[PDB]
Amino acid sequence: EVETFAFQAEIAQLMSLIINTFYSNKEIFLRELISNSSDALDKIRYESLTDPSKLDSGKELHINLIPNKQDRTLTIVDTGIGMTKADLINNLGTIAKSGTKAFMEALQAGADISMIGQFGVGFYSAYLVAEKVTVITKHNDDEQYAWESSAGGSFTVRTDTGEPMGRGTKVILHLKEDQTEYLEERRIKEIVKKHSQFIGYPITLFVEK
Ligand SMILES: Cc1cccc(Oc2ccc(N)cn2)c1C
Structure with a gap:
């Protein structure tokens, strides 16, 4: 059973702008997703200070980067909230919605796409590098869900029957055919070292078999 939803108009406009605009500095996607993972881990860490049983679904707080050349996917896994x-x-x-409106107003005033994180979006x-994004997530208070969108104005949500996650979020980037450089170890290492060197959680870059 798969439910299909329409993005709000403003978010569809932002996704289409990101996919169509000529912008070479695509590597900032990894900084933004790692930053999102680090915020999710801060949240579950804080909540567990006053309620230690929130870590029953997993004590470890980490981030894993998993490239897969056969599927042409890059997966960012965190054990956050x-x-x-x-x-x-x-x-x-x-x-x-409000972050998109502020971001697009800044773009017309001279800002550039690399500042997208300053607006919360x-x-x-x-979608600088992915033609489709799948998100598997599991919160302590709900079931395991799969979210998916190839942009184009819609996204789907369904209950996930795959491997149980315990707790956290898994972002699966189905990469565009001309962005497979982000499957290479030496390239991911360079991006992490340059943009995420001080993240206060262990980042493990998996190697391909
Ligand atoms: C994981 C994540 C984080 C922030 C935004 C986001 O996209 C979404 C998700 C849901 C709706 N309604 C609109 N944008 C996603 C997938």
């Missing part, structure tokens, strides 16, 4: 069904349908889009930079 994860996302509920309401987040995927309502809450994230509500905050992304850094996740959409994944």
Whole structure:
């Protein structure tokens, strides 16, 4: 059972701008997704200071980067607080609406795409390099869900029957055919070292077999 939803008009406009605009500095997608993972891990860490049982679904707080050349996917996994069904349908889009309006006003005033994180909508930079994005997430208070969008104005949500995650978020980037450089180890290492060197969680870059 798969539910299909329309993005709000403003978010569809931002995604289309990100996919169509000529912008060479695409590597900032990884900084934005890692930053999103680090915020999610801060949240579950804080909540567990006053409620240690919130870590029953997983004590480890980390980030894993997994390239897969056979599937042409780059996966960013965190064990953060994860996302509920309401987040995927309502809450994230509500905050992304005003962040998108501020971001697009700044772009006409001279700002550039690399500042997208300053407006809270850094996740959409994944469409600089991905033709489709799948998100598997599990929050302590809800079930495991799969979110997916190839842009074009819509996204889907379904209950995930795959491997149980425990807690956290998995962002699967189905890469465009001409962005496979972000599957190379030496390239991911360079981006992480340059943009995410001080993240206060262990970042493990997996190697391909
Ligand atoms: C994981 C994540 C974080 C922030 C935004 C985001 O996109 C979304 C998600 C849901 C709706 N309604 C609109 N944009 C995603 C997938």
